[PDB]
Amino acid sequence: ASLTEIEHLVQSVCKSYRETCQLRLEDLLRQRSNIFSREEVTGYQRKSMWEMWERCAHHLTEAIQYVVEFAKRLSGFMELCQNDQIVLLKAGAMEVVLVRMCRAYNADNRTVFFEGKYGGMELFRALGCSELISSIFDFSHSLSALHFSEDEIALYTALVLINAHRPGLQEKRKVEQLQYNLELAFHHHLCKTHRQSILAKLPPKGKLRSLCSQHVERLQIFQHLHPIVVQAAFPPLYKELFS
């Protein structure tokens, strides 16, 4: 890859992201003043564990579908063999949502946009996994601190997805080359915008891996308790990724 190639990979990644970002920044920023009441929060806290897990699984699945659409649009992605496409999405889709969450997260009052309003952690108390929720809020709080632009998110999430280290890849060298070009793309843009100061501030890694393992660990506990909720009422795509 020449420099002209990576300069134009930048605009192209950002385009792909803009088209698949799901929720417009403009709407999320505007709806920040729209916060669930104590009564609504209580109503959520009164739901059964399983109704809450189901609700959450549906919303996450919906988010993952945009991520699959993002991936299908990413320069280079559809060029990978089917096996590696599936390995990369099985491992990185939740990760990408976890990064995309920072847009939908308001660090001023620690609220996330959920079913049409902003709410705090406590909104999800029925789930039976407050350690994980807590850590997911923290992660978004840290990312929010960086004042990530839309272009940064696009570039960053394209790298979260294209990870040549994921186990199970048949064509590790092709994804290595792709990862390299996206890394260059990401760092070139940061350089051009005077924003390399953040590279040292980015979240460590595993870190995203930890969150995603906790998610699966927690699912696994819930499935042991409510195995028929999962079989009967969790979306197929979600069971494929995390079950």
């Binding site: 579908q65 699959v68 089917q82 496409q85 599936i86 999405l89 197929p236 795509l237 494929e240 990724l241």
Partner: peptide, 10 residues
């Protein structure tokens, strides 16, 4: 199953 079908779609 489901992802394979998403990737193959028009």
């Amino acid at each position: 199953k489901i992802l394979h079908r998403l990737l193959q779609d028009s």
